Design a protein around this ligand. Structure first.
Ligand code: ZZU
Ligand code: ARG
Ligand code: FE2
Length: 332
């Protein structure tokens, strides 16, 4: 038994999916281009039927923290070395796999990026950056990436975060936890449902973590003057979750809120579990049901470091209309 839902491709299914992604990579200039963004969800209809059935059904299940698809082939020789920075990470060897991620994602929802993260790319990169080992972003290594709701600070945060493992030779675990409903007392639960918490943008939205405009103003506003929000929403018997283990704080001087958040931190720490994304595995983490992070690891810096492609997915792009930054697919 697992807290996520898992699908394993047969070799024939995996080869068919790879061939579809390869054909897309031949026919379109880039994954993030307007043309492929529009076409991917319809092209995805040509993926193996058993996979389409899994994605359609598993998304509607009440319980999973993630949907995990195993068994996509990745040839390290074709892939080439792990890039030294996300800027240079759109390598030809990784290009078909980026298209593949986009196709799988298009079965689940509308993909988007952030003006203030990796130059507004929709398909982004997770890899260790030398000098960045002890940061709070996904290019860390030696310091554990603490558990978080992705883009907790924002009302426009993803419903699902997709991760495709290009390589992970040493088996470094992603971490996950759901709401600790078996342990939260009613009074604590009640407080977590009230708008008594602060949650600021994480460091990935800082200018220092993009390349050499206006959307950074909103990040500054969210950091300097966060509005109180709830941590839990929806059904008390199955809440949705919005929290950042580093950055969540109580509203100013609200000691009851503080106690509830402290209790939540302890209970999530105690229930955190591991999911290892081996080479070729894809996970779609349910960003309303679960927090996620990544274990500490010693980076290699020898060309074979752990490397993921990543994508944000919303069920409804129109929900973020306000934040459409001169187009609907890059937000700020
Ligand atoms: N480290 C914490 N607690 N939160 C922010 C980390 C996020 O995963 C961020 N989007 C990143 O990619 O670095
Ligand atoms: N949304 C679009 N305009 N799609 C068509 C773009 C052309 C692309 N090379 C193709 O194979 O179709
Ligand atoms: Fe994350």
């Amino acid at each position: 038994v697992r807290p996520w839902s898992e699908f394993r491709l047969t070799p024939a299914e995996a080869a068919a999916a790879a061939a579809l992604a390869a054909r897309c990579a031949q026919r379109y200039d880039e994954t993030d281009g307007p043309e492929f963004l529009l076409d991917a969800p319809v092209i995805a209809h040509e993926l193996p039927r058993r996979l389409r059935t899994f994605m359609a059904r598993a998304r509607l299940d009440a319980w999973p923290h993630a949907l995990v698809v195993r068994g996509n082939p990745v040839d390290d020789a074709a892939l080439g070395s792990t890039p030294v920075h996300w800027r240079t990470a759109r390598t030809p060897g990784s290009r078909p796999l980026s298209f593949l991620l986009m196709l799988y994602a298009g079965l689940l929802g509308d993909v988007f990026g952030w003006a203030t993260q990796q130059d507004g790319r929709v398909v982004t990169d997770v890899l260790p950056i030398k000098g960045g080992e002890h940061t709070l972003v996904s290019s860390s290594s030696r310091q554990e990436l603490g558990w978080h709701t992705e883009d907790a600070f924002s009302p426009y945060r993803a419903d699902y975060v997709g991760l495709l493992s290009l390589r992970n030779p040493d088996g470094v675990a992603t971490t996950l936890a759901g709401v600790p409903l078996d342990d939260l007392d009613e009074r604590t639960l009640d407080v977590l449902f009230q708008e008594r918490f602060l949650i600021r943008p994480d460091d990935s939205h800082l200018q220092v973590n993009n390349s050499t405009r206006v959307e950074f103003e909103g990040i500054a506003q969210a950091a300097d003057r966060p509005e109180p929000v709830a941590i839990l929403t929806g059904h008390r018997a199955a809440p949705h979750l919005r929290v950042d283990g580093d950055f969540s704080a109580p509203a100013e001087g609200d000691e009851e809120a503080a106690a509830a958040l402290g209790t939540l931190r302890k209970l999530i720490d105690a229930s955190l579990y591991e999911l290892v994304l081996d080479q070729g595995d894809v996970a779609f983490i349910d960003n309303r049901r679960a927090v996620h992070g990544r274990r500490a690891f010693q980076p290699r810096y020898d060309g074979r470091d752990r490397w993921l492609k990543r994508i944000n997915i919303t069920r409804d792009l129109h929900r973020s209309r306000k934040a459409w930054a001169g187009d609907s697919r890059v937000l700020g």
